[PDB]
Coordinates of C-alpha atoms and ligand atoms in Angstrom, one line a residue:
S19 CA 69.8 101.3 114.1
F20 CA 71.9 104.0 112.4
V21 CA 72.7 105.8 115.7
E22 CA 74.6 102.8 116.9
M23 CA 76.9 103.2 113.9
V24 CA 77.5 107.0 114.3
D25 CA 81.1 107.6 115.6
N26 CA 82.1 104.0 114.9
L27 CA 85.4 105.0 113.2
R28 CA 88.6 106.0 115.1
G29 CA 92.2 106.6 114.2
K30 CA 95.4 108.6 114.6
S31 CA 96.0 111.7 112.5
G32 CA 97.6 110.7 109.2
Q33 CA 97.5 107.0 110.1
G34 CA 94.1 105.7 108.9
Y35 CA 90.4 105.4 109.7
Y36 CA 89.5 102.0 111.3
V37 CA 86.3 100.2 112.4
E38 CA 86.1 97.6 115.1
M39 CA 85.3 94.0 113.9
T40 CA 85.3 90.5 115.4
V41 CA 86.5 87.4 113.6
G42 CA 85.9 83.8 114.7
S43 CA 84.3 81.9 117.6
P44 CA 84.7 83.0 120.3
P45 CA 85.0 86.6 118.8
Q46 CA 88.4 88.1 118.4
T47 CA 88.3 91.9 118.4
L48 CA 90.4 93.7 115.9
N49 CA 90.7 97.2 114.5
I50 CA 90.3 97.2 110.7
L51 CA 91.3 99.9 108.2
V52 CA 88.4 101.1 106.1
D53 CA 89.6 100.9 102.5
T54 CA 87.4 101.7 99.4
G55 CA 90.5 101.3 97.1
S56 CA 90.6 97.5 97.5
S57 CA 88.4 94.4 97.8
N58 CA 90.2 92.0 100.2
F59 CA 89.4 91.6 103.8
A60 CA 92.7 90.7 105.5
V61 CA 94.1 90.6 109.1
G62 CA 97.4 90.2 110.8
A63 CA 97.6 86.6 111.8
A64 CA 101.3 86.4 112.8
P65 CA 103.5 88.4 115.3
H66 CA 104.7 91.7 113.9
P67 CA 106.6 94.5 115.6
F68 CA 103.9 97.1 114.7
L69 CA 101.0 94.8 115.9
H70 CA 99.7 94.5 119.4
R71 CA 97.2 91.8 118.5
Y72 CA 96.5 89.4 115.6
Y73 CA 94.0 86.8 114.4
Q74 CA 94.7 83.4 116.0
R75 CA 93.1 80.8 113.7
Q76 CA 93.8 77.9 116.0
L77 CA 91.6 79.6 118.7
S78 CA 88.6 79.7 116.4
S79 CA 86.1 76.8 116.2
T80 CA 84.5 78.2 113.0
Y81 CA 87.7 78.8 111.1
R82 CA 87.9 77.0 107.7
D83 CA 91.2 76.7 105.8
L84 CA 90.8 77.4 102.1
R85 CA 94.2 75.8 101.4
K86 CA 95.2 78.7 99.1
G87 CA 97.9 81.4 99.3
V88 CA 97.3 85.1 98.4
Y89 CA 99.3 88.2 98.0
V90 CA 97.9 91.7 97.7
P91 CA 100.0 94.7 96.3
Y92 CA 99.0 98.3 97.1
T93 CA 100.7 101.6 96.2
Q94 CA 102.2 102.1 99.6
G95 CA 102.9 98.4 100.6
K96 CA 102.0 94.8 100.3
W97 CA 101.3 91.6 102.2
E98 CA 100.9 87.9 101.6
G99 CA 99.0 85.3 103.6
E100 CA 96.7 82.3 103.6
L101 CA 93.0 82.2 102.6
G102 CA 90.3 81.0 104.9
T103 CA 86.7 81.7 106.0
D104 CA 85.3 82.6 109.4
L105 CA 82.4 84.2 111.1
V106 CA 82.6 88.0 111.2
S107 CA 80.6 90.7 112.9
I108 CA 80.9 94.5 113.4
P109 CA 80.1 95.5 117.1
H110 CA 79.0 99.0 116.1
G111 CA 77.5 98.0 112.7
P112 CA 74.4 96.0 111.8
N113 CA 73.4 93.4 114.3
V114 CA 74.5 90.4 112.2
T115 CA 77.2 87.7 111.8
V116 CA 78.4 86.5 108.4
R117 CA 80.7 83.9 107.1
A118 CA 83.3 85.8 105.0
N119 CA 86.6 85.3 103.3
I120 CA 89.6 86.3 105.4
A121 CA 93.2 86.5 104.4
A122 CA 95.4 85.6 107.3
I123 CA 98.5 87.9 106.9
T124 CA 101.7 85.9 107.5
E125 CA 104.1 88.5 106.1
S126 CA 104.1 92.1 104.9
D127 CA 106.3 94.8 103.5
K128 CA 105.5 98.5 104.5
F129 CA 101.9 97.5 105.1
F130 CA 101.3 98.0 108.9
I131 CA 101.9 101.4 110.4
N132 CA 103.6 101.8 113.7
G133 CA 101.2 103.3 116.3
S134 CA 98.2 103.3 113.9
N135 CA 96.1 101.0 116.1
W136 CA 94.7 98.9 113.3
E137 CA 95.6 95.3 112.6
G138 CA 93.8 94.6 109.4
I139 CA 92.1 96.0 106.3
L140 CA 88.6 96.0 105.0
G141 CA 88.5 96.3 101.2
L142 CA 85.1 97.7 100.2
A143 CA 85.5 97.8 96.4
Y144 CA 84.1 95.2 94.0
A145 CA 85.1 91.6 93.2
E146 CA 86.8 92.5 90.0
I147 CA 89.9 93.8 91.8
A148 CA 89.9 91.1 94.5
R149 CA 93.0 88.9 94.7
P150 CA 93.8 86.2 93.6
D151 CA 90.8 86.7 91.3
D152 CA 87.2 87.8 91.2
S153 CA 86.0 84.5 92.6
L154 CA 87.0 85.6 96.1
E155 CA 83.9 87.2 97.4
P156 CA 84.5 90.6 99.1
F157 CA 83.2 91.1 102.7
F158 CA 80.4 93.6 101.7
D159 CA 79.1 91.3 99.0
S160 CA 79.0 88.5 101.6
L161 CA 77.1 90.8 104.0
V162 CA 74.5 91.8 101.5
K163 CA 74.0 88.2 100.2
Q164 CA 73.7 86.6 103.6
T165 CA 71.6 89.4 105.4
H166 CA 69.0 92.0 104.6
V167 CA 71.5 94.9 104.9
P168 CA 70.8 97.2 102.0
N169 CA 73.5 97.4 99.3
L170 CA 74.9 100.8 100.3
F171 CA 77.3 102.3 102.8
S172 CA 78.3 105.8 103.7
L173 CA 81.6 107.2 105.1
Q174 CA 81.9 110.4 107.1
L175 CA 85.6 110.9 107.8
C176 CA 86.3 113.6 110.4
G177 CA 89.8 115.0 110.3
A178 CA 90.6 118.4 112.0
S179 CA 92.8 112.3 117.2
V180 CA 90.8 111.3 114.1
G181 CA 87.1 110.0 114.0
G182 CA 84.0 109.5 112.0
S183 CA 81.2 107.2 110.9
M184 CA 80.6 104.2 108.6
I185 CA 76.9 103.8 108.2
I186 CA 76.4 100.3 106.8
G187 CA 73.2 99.8 104.8
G188 CA 72.0 103.3 104.6
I189 CA 72.2 107.1 104.9
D190 CA 72.1 109.0 108.2
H191 CA 70.7 112.4 107.4
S192 CA 71.8 114.0 110.7
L193 CA 75.5 113.5 109.5
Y194 CA 75.3 116.1 106.7
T195 CA 73.8 119.4 105.6
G196 CA 72.3 120.6 102.4
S197 CA 71.6 118.1 99.6
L198 CA 73.4 115.0 98.3
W199 CA 74.9 115.2 94.8
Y200 CA 75.5 112.0 93.0
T201 CA 78.2 111.0 90.4
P202 CA 77.9 107.7 88.5
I203 CA 80.2 104.8 89.4
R204 CA 81.6 104.5 85.9
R205 CA 82.7 100.8 86.2
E206 CA 82.3 98.4 89.1
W207 CA 86.0 97.6 90.0
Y208 CA 87.4 100.5 91.9
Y209 CA 84.9 103.2 92.9
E210 CA 85.6 104.9 89.6
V211 CA 84.3 108.3 88.8
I212 CA 84.7 111.0 86.1
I213 CA 86.1 114.4 86.9
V214 CA 85.0 116.9 84.1
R215 CA 86.6 120.2 85.3
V216 CA 89.1 121.5 87.8
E217 CA 89.2 125.0 89.2
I218 CA 91.8 126.6 91.6
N219 CA 90.5 129.8 93.3
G220 CA 87.7 130.0 90.6
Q221 CA 90.2 129.8 87.7
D222 CA 89.8 126.9 85.3
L223 CA 92.9 124.7 85.0
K224 CA 91.9 124.6 81.3
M225 CA 93.3 121.1 80.6
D226 CA 91.7 118.5 78.4
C227 CA 89.3 116.8 80.9
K228 CA 90.8 113.4 79.9
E229 CA 94.0 114.4 81.7
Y230 CA 92.0 114.5 85.0
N231 CA 91.0 110.9 84.6
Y232 CA 94.2 109.5 83.1
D233 CA 94.1 106.6 83.3
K234 CA 91.3 106.5 86.0
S235 CA 89.8 108.5 88.8
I236 CA 88.8 106.7 92.0
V237 CA 87.4 107.5 95.5
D238 CA 89.7 105.9 98.1
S239 CA 89.3 106.0 101.9
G240 CA 92.6 104.1 102.3
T241 CA 94.8 106.8 100.7
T242 CA 95.8 109.9 102.7
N243 CA 96.3 112.3 99.8
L244 CA 94.6 113.8 96.8
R245 CA 96.7 112.1 94.2
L246 CA 96.8 113.6 90.7
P247 CA 98.2 112.5 87.3
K248 CA 101.7 114.0 86.5
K249 CA 100.4 116.7 84.1
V250 CA 97.5 117.7 86.4
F251 CA 99.7 117.6 89.5
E252 CA 102.2 120.0 87.9
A253 CA 99.5 122.4 86.8
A254 CA 98.0 122.3 90.3
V255 CA 101.3 123.0 92.2
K256 CA 102.1 125.8 89.8
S257 CA 98.8 127.5 90.7
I258 CA 99.0 126.9 94.4
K259 CA 102.6 128.1 94.3
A260 CA 101.6 131.3 92.5
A261 CA 98.8 131.9 95.0
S262 CA 101.2 131.5 98.0
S263 CA 104.3 133.1 96.4
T264 CA 104.1 135.7 99.2
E265 CA 105.7 133.1 101.6
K266 CA 108.9 130.9 101.8
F267 CA 108.7 127.1 101.1
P268 CA 111.4 124.6 100.4
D269 CA 110.5 123.0 97.0
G270 CA 110.8 119.6 98.7
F271 CA 107.7 120.7 100.6
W272 CA 105.8 120.6 97.3
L273 CA 107.0 117.0 97.1
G274 CA 105.8 116.2 100.6
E275 CA 109.3 115.6 101.8
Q276 CA 109.6 118.5 104.2
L277 CA 107.2 120.5 106.5
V278 CA 106.3 124.2 106.8
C279 CA 105.9 125.7 110.2
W280 CA 104.3 128.9 111.5
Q281 CA 104.2 130.6 114.9
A282 CA 101.2 128.8 116.5
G283 CA 97.9 130.4 115.3
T284 CA 99.5 132.5 112.6
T285 CA 99.0 130.1 109.7
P286 CA 98.3 132.2 106.6
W287 CA 95.3 130.1 105.3
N288 CA 94.2 133.0 103.1
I289 CA 97.1 132.6 100.7
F290 CA 96.4 128.9 99.9
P291 CA 93.6 128.5 97.2
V292 CA 90.4 126.4 97.3
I293 CA 90.2 123.6 94.8
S294 CA 87.0 122.6 93.0
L295 CA 86.6 119.2 91.4
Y296 CA 83.6 119.0 89.1
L297 CA 82.1 115.5 88.9
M298 CA 79.8 114.0 86.2
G299 CA 76.2 114.2 87.4
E300 CA 73.1 112.0 87.0
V301 CA 71.4 113.7 84.1
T302 CA 72.5 114.7 80.5
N303 CA 75.1 117.5 80.4
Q304 CA 75.0 118.0 84.1
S305 CA 77.8 118.2 86.7
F306 CA 78.3 119.4 90.3
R307 CA 81.4 120.5 92.2
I308 CA 83.0 119.8 95.5
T309 CA 85.3 122.4 96.9
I310 CA 88.1 121.7 99.4
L311 CA 89.8 124.2 101.7
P312 CA 93.6 124.3 102.3
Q313 CA 93.0 122.9 105.8
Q314 CA 92.2 119.6 104.0
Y315 CA 95.3 119.4 101.8
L316 CA 97.8 121.0 104.3
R317 CA 97.7 118.3 106.9
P318 CA 99.0 119.1 110.5
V319 CA 102.0 117.1 111.4
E320 CA 102.5 116.7 115.2
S321 CA 107.4 123.4 120.3
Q322 CA 104.6 125.9 119.8
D323 CA 104.6 125.8 116.0
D324 CA 101.9 124.7 113.6
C325 CA 103.6 122.4 111.1
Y326 CA 102.0 121.0 107.9
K327 CA 102.6 118.6 105.1
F328 CA 101.6 119.2 101.4
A329 CA 99.0 116.4 100.9
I330 CA 98.6 116.8 97.1
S331 CA 100.9 114.3 95.4
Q332 CA 101.8 112.8 92.0
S333 CA 100.5 109.5 90.6
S334 CA 101.1 107.4 87.5
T335 CA 97.9 105.3 88.0
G336 CA 95.3 108.1 87.8
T337 CA 93.5 110.5 90.2
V338 CA 93.1 109.2 93.8
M339 CA 90.5 111.1 95.8
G340 CA 91.8 110.2 99.2
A341 CA 91.1 111.4 102.8
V342 CA 92.0 114.9 101.7
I343 CA 88.9 115.0 99.6
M344 CA 86.7 112.7 101.7
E345 CA 87.2 114.5 105.0
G346 CA 85.2 117.5 103.9
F347 CA 82.2 115.4 102.9
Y348 CA 79.6 112.8 103.8
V349 CA 80.2 110.2 101.0
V350 CA 77.6 107.8 100.0
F351 CA 78.7 104.6 98.2
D352 CA 75.3 103.7 96.6
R353 CA 76.1 100.3 95.1
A354 CA 72.5 99.5 94.4
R355 CA 72.1 102.5 92.1
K356 CA 75.7 102.6 90.9
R357 CA 76.4 106.2 92.2
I358 CA 78.5 108.0 94.8
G359 CA 76.8 110.9 96.7
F360 CA 78.6 113.9 98.2
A361 CA 77.3 116.3 100.8
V362 CA 79.0 118.8 103.1
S363 CA 79.5 116.9 106.4
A364 CA 78.5 117.9 109.9
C365 CA 82.2 117.6 110.8
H366 CA 83.6 119.8 108.1
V367 CA 86.8 121.7 108.7
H368 CA 86.4 125.4 109.5
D369 CA 87.9 128.4 107.6
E370 CA 86.9 131.9 108.8
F371 CA 85.8 133.3 105.4
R372 CA 85.6 130.1 103.2
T373 CA 83.6 126.9 103.3
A374 CA 83.9 123.4 101.8
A375 CA 80.9 123.1 99.5
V376 CA 78.9 120.7 97.3
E377 CA 77.2 122.7 94.7
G378 CA 75.1 122.2 91.6
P379 CA 73.7 121.8 89.0
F380 CA 76.3 122.9 86.4
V381 CA 76.3 122.5 82.6
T382 CA 79.1 120.5 81.1
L383 CA 79.0 119.5 77.5
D384 CA 80.7 116.3 76.2
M385 CA 81.3 114.8 79.7
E386 CA 81.8 111.3 78.2
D387 CA 84.9 112.7 76.4
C388 CA 86.4 113.1 79.9
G389 CA 86.6 109.3 80.5
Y390 CA 89.9 107.6 79.5
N391 CA 89.8 104.5 77.3
Ligands
LIG15 C1 94.2 102.1 93.9 O1 95.0 102.4 95.0 C2 94.9 101.4 96.1 C3 95.5 101.9 97.3 C4 94.9 101.3 98.6 O2 93.8 102.2 99.0 C5 95.9 101.2 99.7 C6 95.2 100.6 101.0 O3 95.7 101.0 102.2 C7 97.0 100.7 102.6 C8 97.5 101.4 103.8 C9 98.8 101.1 104.2 F1 99.3 101.7 105.3 C10 99.7 100.3 103.5 C11 99.2 99.6 102.4 F2 100.0 98.8 101.7 C12 97.9 99.8 101.9 N1 96.4 102.5 100.1 C13 97.7 102.9 99.8 O4 98.4 102.3 99.1 C14 98.2 104.2 100.3 C15 98.0 104.5 101.7 C16 98.5 105.7 102.2 C17 98.3 105.9 103.7 O5 99.1 106.6 104.3 N2 97.2 105.4 104.2 C18 96.9 105.5 105.6 C19 96.4 104.2 106.3 C20 95.8 106.6 105.8 C21 94.6 106.5 105.1 C22 93.6 107.5 105.3 C23 93.9 108.6 106.0 C24 95.1 108.7 106.7 C25 96.1 107.7 106.6 C26 99.1 106.6 101.4 C27 99.2 106.4 100.0 N3 99.9 107.3 99.2 C28 100.7 106.8 98.1 S1 99.9 108.9 99.5 C29 101.2 109.3 100.4 O6 98.7 109.3 100.1 O7 100.0 109.6 98.2 C30 98.8 105.2 99.5 C31 95.6 100.1 95.7 O8 96.8 100.1 95.6 N4 94.8 99.0 95.4 C32 95.4 97.7 94.9 C33 96.1 97.9 93.6 O9 95.6 98.7 92.8 N5 97.2 97.2 93.4 C34 97.9 97.3 92.1 C35 99.4 97.7 92.4 C36 99.6 98.9 92.9 C37 101.0 99.3 93.2 C38 102.0 98.3 93.0 C39 101.7 97.1 92.5 C40 100.4 96.7 92.2 C41 94.4 96.6 94.8 C42 94.4 95.8 96.1 C43 93.0 97.0 94.3

């Protein structure tokens, strides 16, 4: 039942959304970071200063050694470990147990986060970007093949410590308002999408739409920020800076290195612009937009001051639509129909005079020119 899966995600602010899972026989309970930017299911399997628990392969009767090493690099960090298979279930997911590939993490560099409360990672993207190669079947592929769970999952990330829902095998209509707007998954590797237009406070950024997707645009639950290609990032900061030029910020703030603080409850939300990302739609020459509020990209960092970090950052590997984007929305990863749905979520962040919105339809000619090759 879908109700059993509502509120199945937890986390600390700025530290990651995790789901509870069990590995092995008898079941070993671990908290697992939900990550749509990768395809490897991996858990801590050796003592680590940031870990309070880990996977103990010697305690599992259903553990099978695959006799093969693996390393997975990410933008922020990396780990290496030993491949194996074991029985896996999700307590607040579908009522099933599957045999899935698990990477037992033996060492890592800047991977685990101190106090984050998660001990592993669930890579939900496709086999193509799985390590060591595409022959290592991702967890969700194993779930769908072994059970009758439909080939779809949705993520409701609630920011505003942190919580939300991962509905596995379907769409829970009580978790969003309005209608769902779908953008094609361009290629089945990352959850790749095409951004066709960008507006800041209703003003078109007016760049060649290829720049927005240079060299790719992905939807990623494992990344905190809205990450933008160099040229786009610089055009965005220039606009946000112009709009908030009334107030005083160190320029290291715009790089995410320093915080800005305000007397508690006096945050000048009005001076920071809304950002609209127009995504390719389902029919010819059609797009739709998703609008984010400053409350999404100015993230509260925990005195009676309200202090924030600028959570729009630069990237040299394309646009990353991280938690900044996803937190406003109920996001449907419709793998069966090769599309990603966006709707305003029931736990959307509140501005007094503005709203996070999913709106359409829009006309956009030559949308296929926006994809980078
Ligand atoms: C495409 O981007 C993905 C990024 C992933 O989603 C990974 C998966 O998650 C983690 C989380 C960690 F704490 C550490 C870590 F090492 C990974 N995410 C990140 O690398 C990442 C996590 C975070 C981050 O703080 N994540 C925490 C858990 C979070 C998530 C959601 C909400 C709040 C907190 C931040 C960033 N940024 C750079 S930032 C500051 O936002 O701009 C990046 C990726 O790197 N995928 C891999 C990849 O492309 N590797 C190629 C590569 C990249 C870099 C270097 C060499 C090779 C493959 C496995 C598919």
